[PDB]
Design a protein around this ligand. Structure first.
Ligand code: QQ9
Length: 167
């Protein structure tokens, strides 16, 4: 038993809710919240900008030190940093950005990072401003992640489309 509430169960291990991931993180305080990161951990907009704003820019300060030490992430890669006031940990995961021409096949590699964590609160990778089809992202999620994932979809219209079209 865990504290996630109001989710629709899609599969054995994948759950979905129309929710603001920032507000969901603030209430649940999950062990892991996933950020829709880029390779530079520049949290300017989308999910990343919202998560970072909710940390009062502490996420960005920590991220800048991480990059100064380690260099950029790989597309499809991840790193574990603090969850600040939102979660114990933040798993920064880089899905491919279609608006930059990155290979969509890397979306499966991106979701594989979730398997290193027993339970996660997450957005749909490569959705939103990353330009992928969220229905495809949900399919890859279901077919790749084996650990327990609670997906938060900000847009109610999109949420209904994702549920109604789910196979
Ligand atoms: O989900 C939607 O409707 C939008 C379009 C797809 C990408 N988005 C998210 O992944 C998301 C989900 C939940 N809270 C969020 N806060 C900021 C982004 C965000 C936003």
């Amino acid at each position: 038993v865990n504290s996630f509430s109001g989710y629709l169960k899609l599969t054995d291990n994948v759950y979905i809710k129309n929710a603001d991931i920032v507000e969901e993180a603030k209430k649940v305080k999950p062990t892991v919240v996933v950020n829709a990161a880029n390779v530079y951990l520049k949290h300017g907009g989308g999910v990343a900008g919202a998560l970072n704003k909710a940390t009062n820019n502490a996420m960005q300060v920590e991220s800048d030190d991480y990059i100064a030490t380690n260099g950029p992430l790989k597309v499809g890669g991840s790193c574990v940093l603090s969850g600040h006031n939102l979660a114990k940990h933040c798993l920064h995961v880089v899905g491919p950005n279609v608006n930059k021409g990155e290979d969509i096949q890397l979306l499966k590699s991106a979701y594989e990072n979730f398997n290193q964590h027993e339970v996660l609160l997450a957005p749909l990778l490569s959705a939103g401003i990353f330009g992928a089809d969220p229905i495809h992202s949900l399919r890859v999620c279901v077919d790749t992640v084996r650990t327990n994932v609670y997906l938060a979809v900000f847009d109610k219209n999109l949420y209904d489309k994702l549920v109604s079209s789910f196979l």
